[PDB]
Design a protein around this ligand. Sequence first.
Ligand SMILES: *O[C@H]1[C@@H](O)[C@H](n2cnc3c(=O)[nH]c(N)nc32)O[C@@H]1COP(=O)(O)OP(=O)(O)OP(=O)(O)O
Ligand SMILES: *O[C@H]1[C@@H](O)[C@H](n2cnc3c(=O)[nH]c(N)nc32)O[C@@H]1COP(=O)(O)OP(=O)(O)OP(=O)(O)O
Ligand SMILES: *O[C@H]1[C@@H](O)[C@H](n2cnc3c(=O)[nH]c(N)nc32)O[C@@H]1COP(=O)(O)OP(=O)(O)OP(=O)(O)O
Ligand SMILES: *O[C@H]1[C@@H](O)[C@H](n2cnc3c(=O)[nH]c(N)nc32)O[C@@H]1COP(=O)(O)OP(=O)(O)OP(=O)(O)O
Ligand SMILES: [Mg+2]
Ligand SMILES: [Mg+2]
Ligand SMILES: [Mg+2]
Ligand SMILES: [Mg+2]
Ligand SMILES: [Zn+2]
Ligand SMILES: [Zn+2]
Lengths: 221, 647, 224, 222
Amino acid sequence: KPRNYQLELALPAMKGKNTIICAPTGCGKTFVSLLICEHHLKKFPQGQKGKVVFFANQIPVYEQQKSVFSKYFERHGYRVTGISGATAENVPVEQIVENNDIIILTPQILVNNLKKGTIPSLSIFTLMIFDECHNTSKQHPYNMIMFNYLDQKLGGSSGPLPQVIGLTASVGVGDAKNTDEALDYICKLCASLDASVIATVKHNLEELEQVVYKPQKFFRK
Amino acid sequence: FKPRNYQLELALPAMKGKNTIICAPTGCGKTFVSLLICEHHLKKFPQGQKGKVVFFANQIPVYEQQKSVFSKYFERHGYRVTGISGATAENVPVEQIVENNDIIILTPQILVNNLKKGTIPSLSIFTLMIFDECHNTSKQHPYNMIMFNYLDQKLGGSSGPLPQVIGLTASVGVGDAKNTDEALDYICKLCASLDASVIATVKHNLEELEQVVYKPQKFFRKVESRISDKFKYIIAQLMRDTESLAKRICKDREFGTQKYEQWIVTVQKACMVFQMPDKDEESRICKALFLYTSHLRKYNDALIISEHARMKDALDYLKDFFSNVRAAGFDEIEQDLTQRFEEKLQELESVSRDPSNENPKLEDLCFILQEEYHLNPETITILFVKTRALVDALKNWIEGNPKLSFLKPGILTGRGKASGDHNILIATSVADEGIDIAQCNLVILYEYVGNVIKMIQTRGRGRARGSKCFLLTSNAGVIEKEQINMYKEKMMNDSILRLQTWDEAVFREKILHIQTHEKFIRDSVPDKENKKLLCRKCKALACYTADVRVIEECHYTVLGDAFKECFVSRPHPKPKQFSSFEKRAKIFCARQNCSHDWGIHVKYKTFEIPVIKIESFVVEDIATGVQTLYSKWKDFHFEKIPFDPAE
Amino acid sequence: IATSVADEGIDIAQCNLVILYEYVGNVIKMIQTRGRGRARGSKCFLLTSNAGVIEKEQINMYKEKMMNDSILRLQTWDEAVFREKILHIQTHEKFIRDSKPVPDKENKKLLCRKCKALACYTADVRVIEECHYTVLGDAFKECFVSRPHPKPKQFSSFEKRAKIFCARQNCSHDWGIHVKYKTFEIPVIKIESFVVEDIATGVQTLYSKWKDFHFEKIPFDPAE
Amino acid sequence: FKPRNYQLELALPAMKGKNTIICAPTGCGKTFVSLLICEHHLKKFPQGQKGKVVFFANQIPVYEQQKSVFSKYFERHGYRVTGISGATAENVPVEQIVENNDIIILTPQILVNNLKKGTIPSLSIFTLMIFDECHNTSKQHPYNMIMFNYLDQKLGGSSGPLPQVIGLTASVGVGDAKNTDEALDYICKLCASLDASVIATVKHNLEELEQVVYKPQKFFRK
RNA sequence: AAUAUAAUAGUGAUAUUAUAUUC
RNA sequence: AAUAUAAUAGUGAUAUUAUAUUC
RNA sequence: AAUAUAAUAGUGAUAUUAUAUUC
RNA sequence: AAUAUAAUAGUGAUAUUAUAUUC
Ligand SMILES: *O[C@H]1[C@@H](O)[C@H](n2cnc3c(=O)[nH]c(N)nc32)O[C@@H]1COP(=O)(O)OP(=O)(O)OP(=O)(O)O
Ligand SMILES: *O[C@H]1[C@@H](O)[C@H](n2cnc3c(=O)[nH]c(N)nc32)O[C@@H]1COP(=O)(O)OP(=O)(O)OP(=O)(O)O
Ligand SMILES: *O[C@H]1[C@@H](O)[C@H](n2cnc3c(=O)[nH]c(N)nc32)O[C@@H]1COP(=O)(O)OP(=O)(O)OP(=O)(O)O
Ligand SMILES: *O[C@H]1[C@@H](O)[C@H](n2cnc3c(=O)[nH]c(N)nc32)O[C@@H]1COP(=O)(O)OP(=O)(O)OP(=O)(O)O
Ligand SMILES: [Mg+2]
Ligand SMILES: [Mg+2]
Ligand SMILES: [Mg+2]
Ligand SMILES: [Mg+2]
Ligand SMILES: [Zn+2]
Ligand SMILES: [Zn+2]
């Protein structure tokens, strides 16, 4: 039984919109991910099937997400697998991606396999989820994958592209000294993830504030 | 191809770029007129430009026919012909299909819907429009919606180019006009609806036209009603005993008439809103009342059927009814009523097996058929009746009659809830002209009441010289209706010939006036608290208005696993795909074999969902307790939550 | 409160009290049930009004003694000899294991076991993947009702959607299920709900399982 | 309608997805055979997928007839039928026309020219191909050019999905063959041209067929 | 302009003519 | 679900039924 | 639809019911 | 080996160090 604000955060994503989901740490973004993935996979007709890729930037988060998704989606008939640096070598990555509906990856695997050529395009995925998506910027692996995405989009490749969902507790304003510059930075981040929507808790705020409380900060000089 | 002179004469005003209503007798070959107009229209453009024609067929057979003819004819000229009907309208790029074809055959609802969605931005994309049976352009008919768009663009400041409008009809109609002047008004309003400045009729070439389409002679047969009803004498006792049974539970007009039908329907709707503290008892007596009024209705129907046909046919109607009832299941009330019916069955079949009781109308009909087939054994007949029950009735009556043995009957009805060997074709009615069938040199109208347009159109079956049309009735009013319809035709032709004499400019001015007036006329709080939806028969709880979702601002479905326990289902007798929906099965009330029809079960996109009609339910307000009944979902006013796939 | 659990199953909370109410089982389940009593001081009561049940599980205890003793005996044997004996038993079992009735092509009639209404014909019955049986034609569709399945499940290539019942005079006898199989939406019927009348003879016989019903079973062809 | 048994028999190898040359006497109603195969082909696809059938008529009258019949038959089932001939082939978005229609009747030269022009990138857009009078596939005839494209795609390194291929003929021909072995070679070469692994003829149902198409008695007047 | 079939001349590729079709 | 026609009830917007069509 | 276990009649293959599981 | 963040120096690209991660 999901909390209301989780449904509220998941709603723009479930409508097929590329979305940056911004909510405080500990609000249970995992279940949001599960809802988005479930709705995304079940929406496809009989003659078609979706493929979801979940990017976790760290091995503990990788294993956790892999376990949770495997336990949750085994029932619905979706095969969940994962590729980390340990199991990434001397394996048919293309087949592993092809033979599974949900694939949990550390971004470096996809970067390496993309530039190596084993995975020709991102068109193989119908959905992408970046955990801690604020990391998409500069030379970070996230941003490299997204560079592949945008290179395909802005080019004449004319191939189908996956829906992109970011997840973060903060997008960040960067070095911005004022709200205008902040707006520009946030816009550039949205551009990085090709997101047209930023989802935050609005209607359900009072419920959210009964879960994650803001601690008091003191300054000792 | 060798076109007749009157066809060129009719097509001439349209070829001059004039918006034109083409009025000519049914069967004169209007298709060739359309072909000529389209060919000339397409070939008139310079090299750097091209025209786009859209043809409106109101019915699918006409759609396929016209699409085929236009494709076969215009392929050699380098013009692509396509079509979009209800079947092929879904999940297709309508805009591109229109853009990539020169001639497009369409059922009007496609264009109305696509204009409403905005997929087709403007009517400016067409340089020519052709309305088949253009007399249908009026009121809320799809044709008139299209023309609403057209005139909204013309009278507006958009200043976009508009297509030439060509209507086609056998009769424009005078409407309700009691005199020629008012008829002139109606015709002018029609011309305003189609934005037509010209009414084209055959004048110079009439002598050629009259050698193709001949006017059949019309005879009026006025007969007497059957002199004595034994059948109604005894069945009025079953109506009386049933309304006496109803007279036990109630705590609260002639038989065999429409008045009694209206009364018993209003009563049936009155019994659904009665309430008690005990709800199960309420369900019992409401089911009882529903059943009583139902049997009453069926008995009434039997009376009427036997008025217009054999008493055996009415008896068999009731027997079919009770057969179905027996198939439904054993209900105490139904078993009772069927029992009391079965008590009188012997007496009844005793009373319709007698040759003495045969109705005067069927005797006279038999006389007509006998004489006409005696004179001409090769005669092909078509027999129009009001109801399908009468279709079956006369179907059985003909082959159940030894004297009519030369007849080989056939059936023509609608789909919904000479060289061959069929000599006579019994039918209900056919919308407009339709596809040409075998020529009938005998047309029998049995208790038929039409309008002037249908009268003029039915002549198309009699095109051959020597065709005859009889009107047989016991009502004596029907005669008068047909006669005043003939007078209406006179008014029509005279008013048309008067309009043709006007200066075209002045006529355009009057038309513009009418159009602007009509546009002026045309341009002229939902309840948020939860309601209950109860069965209209057993008063059982079916749904809550919070569970109801609205798909495409039209169809209504239900969410939750709760509703799945309230209904049963059986595969749909007539599986049909409407819009984006595909009919699968019928859903009925599941409580104690109530089996009341709640709606249908359909496949919509990826979902398998039930769709219900408010007509089958009673709306109870939780707060007040007041129960209400509703026409259609349009008249039910509450805030309707759109269907969300993500919900 | 529970009915039964196959084998050990998932590990549950530790119960220091296990009560068997009119319960009868084998030695294996007896030893497995102890797994819920792992902690010291756990107790197991067997409560019955039958002088038999007690006797049953004590001969089960004796069976356990025999088991442990026999295992202790087998563990003293030489592994080579044991391999030899095992191979002997294996070959024997394979010999026993390595060691079809003529189908009836006469058209039968499948009648409702309750109301004796005609449901199906054996000419209409088609077999999907050697196991499940369906009914062709639009004739069958007027013989049955359907209700949304209370426990929809996916088995193999099939998806359960509705349950189907008899339509005649509210017989409502359970004839089978209605399923989505590949591209087709089709009913699947069980023979245990029907009576077979060969009306050549006029004889009515009853079959519990489909594989015990021998008639001509034609494969399901999408190309029909 | 009510198909004759030999028609179902002839269509059966095609309805199982095999590339098939159908060889039957002239006037046995091959039209309804095509209708059967096409209907089954289009209805076999799941919801999220759809097929595209292309019918090759070598002559304009046959083109118009087949276009008409297919249109009248498949309109009710929700399949758009169209056609492209020499008259309608110029200054039109042929690629879009192919894309936006389920059943397309072509004269072969349209497909040849449009394949060569590049407007139709691959035959992978069609899930089914039907050649009327398929014995014409040989030498430089347009049919054989189309099949050259097909076979170049098949035998080539990168090969996408390929359409099922159904030929229709009264006679496959033996060529100049002077004996049954050379005839066998010619027939095998023809089957190789159309990529057909099955030759369907009427065998089980022969009596029914011989009640429909009778063989005229031939006399020679010297 | 291209394609097919037939007859012909030639050992053959082909060539002439006849016939049909297509873009 | 929408639309048209006819009869009936009402002064009428409408309403009921019948018939047909469309999406 | 298959599989296992238990009770019950049969000497037994089995059969009925109960329970549980799997595809 | 790659990447991110922070401090510091520099107008800046960057550079040093610290910290963390990934392959
Ligand atoms: O070289 C040919 C050709 O370029 C052109 N031509 C004439 N008809 C066609 C045609 O149907 N298709 C194509 N692709 N090209 C065509 O004309 C040149 C020769 O002219 P002709 O005198 O031989 O042709 P004409 O129209 O006078 O007579 P015919 O075509 O009926 O035989
Ligand atoms: O409210 C209606 C409607 O939502 C839906 N429905 C049924 N047929 C159609 C249709 O042709 N076009 C549209 N837009 N909507 C349709 O069903 C609801 C009512 O169900 P019914 O019981 O009246 O439908 P049924 O098939 O049983 O009768 P009928 O359609 O043959 O007259
Ligand atoms: O003959 C059976 C069978 O073909 C099919 N069926 C039903 N459930 C399954 C299943 O779990 N696995 C397989 N392989 N096949 C199955 O249904 C036919 C009989 O229908 P039932 O009424 O017995 O099945 P139902 O769902 O109504 O009851 P239940 O078995 O789940 O309890
Ligand atoms: O140039 C580097 C590099 O080639 C190699 N190396 C060491 N660790 C890694 C690694 O995690 N991933 C990759 N791709 N390459 C690696 O060693 C060379 C330098 O040796 P170092 O002394 O700097 O590395 P070392 O293991 O000794 O120290 P540390 O990296 O654990 O702190
Ligand atoms: Mg799917
Ligand atoms: Mg053939
Ligand atoms: Mg499909
Ligand atoms: Mg060519
Ligand atoms: Zn009910
Ligand atoms: Zn039954």
